[PDB]
């Protein structure tokens, strides 16, 4: 798309979000509370916004999406099928921080509500191949300490953790599916 969907939907102005941050680092206040909010109209857009690369949209979309996932409740299950394309394309954007953020978002999605792993099981073909290529790549600094784990950009460790948490909830067929998609995966 020529212009980002979150861009043309934020200058749209119908977002209930406003940064207005007076806190430790940053925060966002909302003129609409989630129980009034309809997730069908908004969650695809928020997951779409993760692809955006220039400020303040990245922070806005990240915070909104994570808090929606946290306090959505059972409503996430219904909007699951629509979310597959944005999370696939954001992962395909091949940018390192974008993969890190969307990786964390997938983790919080899977752990957010129950009875969603089985529903996502048919959908590995969309989302795993991007992680397949970079599972191999990793840093080998040697003896020395790594001081950088304060923030999480180690793509290999993060994807391995996501595979672990994903399989812990997927079920019986999840293991064979993920092994089929990525060969080097190891049983847990």
């Amino acid at each position: 798309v020529e212009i980002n969907l979150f861009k043309k939907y934020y200058d749209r102005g119908d977002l209930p979000i406003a940064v207005n941050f007076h806190g430790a680092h940053r925060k966002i206040s909302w003129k609409l509370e989630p129980e009034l909010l309809d997730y069908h109209l908004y969650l695809p857009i928020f997951f779409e916004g993760l692809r955006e690369t220039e400020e303040p949209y990245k922070f806005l979309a990240d915070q909104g999406c994570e808090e929606l996932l946290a306090r959505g409740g059972a409503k996430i299950f219904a909007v699951l099928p629509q979310l597959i394309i944005p999370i696939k394309k954001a992962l395909s954007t091949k940018s390192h921080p974008i993969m890190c953020t969307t990786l964390k978002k997938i983790q919080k999605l899977v752990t957010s509500s129950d009875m969603i792993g089985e529903a996502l099981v048919p959908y590995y073909r969309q989302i795993l191949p991007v992680m397949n290529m970079f599972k191999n790549k990793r840093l080998n600094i040697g003896d020395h300490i790594d001081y950088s784990q304060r923030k999480n950009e180690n793509l290999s460790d993060l994807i391995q953790e996501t595979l672990e948490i994903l399989e812990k909830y997927g079920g019986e067929d999840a293991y064979i599916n993920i092994k089929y998609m990525i060969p080097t995966y190891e049983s847990c």
Partner: protein, 439 residues
């Protein structure tokens, strides 16, 4: 009263078994129909065939052999061949579906339905035998069915019979020449399987015999049959002392008393001489000294290995012909003298010598010529670790990112078996390195 049983598995096993069985029949004077001719007798003595054949009571003879395969093409061809009247027609066990180079298929899926018939035939053949010496087993290692069936048969036999000696004549894949692409996997798995179950193994790779045929036989376009004839001659030289009179006989049981310093190290490499054509052989002396020098010449090793890269552990060598023990001892003196051949320190003398009287026979239409004196040498040496190292590296390259592994996972074998063979070969390498150091 002394006998051995021959097992052939795989297409390579069959194509070498037919070659060696032609040689045995010609050497014992048996017509391909199996009947010794009423007139025209070439073999004196009695029960000479008893090592490899058994009398039917009146007339012909049946070999003490069994043929195993899962793909019926070669079995049908041999049953349509001229040796149709020779073999018992229900010991040529043929399956329906080939394992298709898949070791897991040949060890877990389709070999289990043929193993019962094979063991029943083994029991039936062994019941006739009275002084069972041992079993010979032939199989190309770079094949799924060959490797899997050989492993399963050795596994069953080691528990069914126990202490009976078995000799595996394996044809390992060449260093860089190869026909398939998956052969390192099944080679490593099969060697792991047979390491703890075979008493003696012989190296028979292809590039070495290729270069021997090129350099000596002067053949530029050779085929598999000439190779099989060479291995057949090696077999005949190995077992001629068992059934033929000689000044210093050597039994198969007199190998596990002479060539295996430790239970782990039982892979040996062979050599044979002379290799020379009838257009060429008749201008030279073919004397014992020069023939035994050609025997230890490194480029004439039957397997693609360099003996100069390691020490020698033991060497058992058999002469057949009109050799003289004084001449043999004098030649061994020179061999011990020479510089480039050095032995391990804890082995003061490492030679076993055998002498047999009658020269090796020649196959009509073959390649070799007739000579009084022939030498077949079997050596255990520290230099053999290089092939294990290189096959380990080749296996490592493909197993690094789990290539071709799912076609083995999907036939019932678990994931962790490959690493077992890997660690076994690592232990073997460490064992060779530890033994090879001086005190």
């Amino acid at each position: 009263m002394r006998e051995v049983i021959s097992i052939h598995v795989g297409q390579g096993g069959i194509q070498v078994g037919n070659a060696c069985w032609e040689l045995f029949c010609l050497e014992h004077g048996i017509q391909p129909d199996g009947q010794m001719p009423s007139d025209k007798t070439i073999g004196g003595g009695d029960d000479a065939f008893n090592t490899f054949f058994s009398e039917t009571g009146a007339g012909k003879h049946v070999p003490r052999a069994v043929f195993l395969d899962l793909e019926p093409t070669v079995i049908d061809e041999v049953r349509t061949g001229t040796y149709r009247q020779l073999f018992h027609p229900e010991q040529l066990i043929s399956g329906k579906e080939d394992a298709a180079n898949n070791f897991a298929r040949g060890h877990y899926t389709i070999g289990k339905e043929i193993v019962d018939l094979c063991l029943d035939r083994i029991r039936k053949l062994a019941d006739n035998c009275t002084g069972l010496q041992g079993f010979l087993v032939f199989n190309s290692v770079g094949g799924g069915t060959g490797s899997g069936l050989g492993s399963l048969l050795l596994e069953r036999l080691s528990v069914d019979y126990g202490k009976k000696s078995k000799l595996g004549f394996t044809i390992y894949p060449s260093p860089q020449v190869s026909t398939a692409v998956v052969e390192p996997y099944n080679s490593i798995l099969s060697t792991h399987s047979l390491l703890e179950h075979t008493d003696v193994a012989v190296m028979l790779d292809n590039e070495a015999i290729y270069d021997i045929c090129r350099r000596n036989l002067d053949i530029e376009r050779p085929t598999y049959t000439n190779l099989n004839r060479l291995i057949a001659q090696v077999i005949s030289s190995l077992t001629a002392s068992l059934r033929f009179d000689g000044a210093l006989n050597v039994d198969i049981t007199e190998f596990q008393t002479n060539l295996v310093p430790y239970p782990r190290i039982h892979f040996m490499l062979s050599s044979y001489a002379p290799i020379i054509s009838a257009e060429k052989a008749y201008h030279e002396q073919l004397s014992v000294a020069e023939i035994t020098n050609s025997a230890f010449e490194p480029a004439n090793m039957m397997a693609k290995c360099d003996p100069r890269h390691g020490k020698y552990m033991a060497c058992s060598m058999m002469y057949r012909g009109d050799v003289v023990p004084k001449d043999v001892n004098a030649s061994i003196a020179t061999i011990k003298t020479k510089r480039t051949i050095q032995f391990v320190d804890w082995c003061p003398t490492g030679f076993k010598v055998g002498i047999n009287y009658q020269p090796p026979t020649v196959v009509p239409g073959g390649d070799l010529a007739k000579v009084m004196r022939a030498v077949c040498m079997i050596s255990n040496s520290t230099a053999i670790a290089e092939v294990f190292s290189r096959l380990d590296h080749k296996f490592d390259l493909m197993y690094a990112k789990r290539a071709f592994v799912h076609w083995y996972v999907g036939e019932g074998m678990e994931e962790g078996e490959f690493s077992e063979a890997r660690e076994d070969l690592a232990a073997l390498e460490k064992d060779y390195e530890e033994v090879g150091i001086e005190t």
